[PDB]
């Protein structure tokens, strides 16, 4: 589709020129555009050319490509990757749920609760224990803890030479 | 109330098992 199609749709292939079916050679031209030849049987084709996604936002490109796959029953997979360094992930909050750890978070959580009801006197005066009780160990699922709440920001900033 | 550790553990485990089976 980066070729000047209106001038090259003739003069591409010779035997198509002989038979006179040059207007029906597969190509781009001539929100999304519905292709037609994807309705009849596809036996002598093996490759899908995908065009129109460069320059757009990531999530909309994913949504549009997946819906287009669903509408015509095509077979391929889709992933996305980034160019850069790791510490650029500062414009987003990171969280997650792993099944492998669920049975642990319960096991721990209730345990702490029990310990609360046996050292309550001294513990309800230590500020650190109250903050740790009301920030963690009081949430239903571990998925609600973001990645930034697990470490000290100042030491991490001290880890890069630029901060000095 | 002595079974509450088992309560939370089994709640989480049975939920995960239920989702995979569903």
């Amino acid at each position: 589709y980066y070729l000047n199609y209106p001038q090259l749709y003739q003069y591409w292939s010779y035997d198509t020129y002989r038979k006179g079916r040059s207007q029906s050679h597969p190509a781009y031209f001539y929100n999304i555009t519905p292709n037609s030849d994807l309705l009849h049987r596809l036996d002598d084709y093996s490759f899908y050319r995908i065009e129109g996604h460069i320059g757009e936002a990531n999530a909309t490109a994913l949504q549009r490509i997946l819906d287009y796959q669903q509408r015509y029953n095509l077979a391929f997979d889709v992933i996305t990757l980034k160019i850069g360094n790791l510490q650029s992930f500062q414009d987003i909050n990171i969280s997650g749920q792993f099944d492998d750890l669920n049975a642990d978070f319960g096991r721990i959580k209730d345990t702490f609760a029990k310990l609360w009801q046996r050292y309550e006197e001294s513990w309800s005066r230590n500020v650190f224990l109250y903050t740790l009780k009301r920030v963690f160990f009081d949430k239903t699922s571990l998925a609600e803890i973001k990645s930034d709440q697990l470490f000290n920001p100042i030491v991490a900033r001290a880890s890069v030479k630029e901060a000095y | 109330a002595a079974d509450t550790l088992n309560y939370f553990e089994l709640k989480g485990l049975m939920t995960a098992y239920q989702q995979r089976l569903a």
Partner: protein, 87 residues
């Protein structure tokens, strides 16, 4: 260990063979490649101007394609969530 596999130069060491053909073979894998806005517009109601200039350099712009000759997907319900941070 999951977030570190979102980067091109580190994904490439576990799955070598990426090439650009402008599409995907039947049954293959289509890889999009994106970058932050800060790296494209290097140097081009004042408060609305400032917030627009800031948010339009945090966007993810799709820049390139590649293809792979295999699909890797098969009922676990573990996942990772990424939430855009407010300005």
């Amino acid at each position: 260990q999951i977030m570190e596999l979102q980067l091109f130069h580190k994904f490439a060491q576990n799955n070598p063979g990426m090439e650009h053909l402008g599409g995907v073979p039947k049954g293959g894998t289509f890889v999009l490649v994106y970058v932050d806005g800060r790296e494209l517009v290097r140097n081009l109601s004042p408060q609305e101007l400032a917030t627009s200039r800031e948010l339009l350099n945090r966007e993810d712009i799709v820049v390139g394609d590649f293809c792979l000759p295999y699909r890797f997907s098969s009922p676990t319900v573990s996942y990772v969530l990424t939430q855009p941070r407010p300005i």
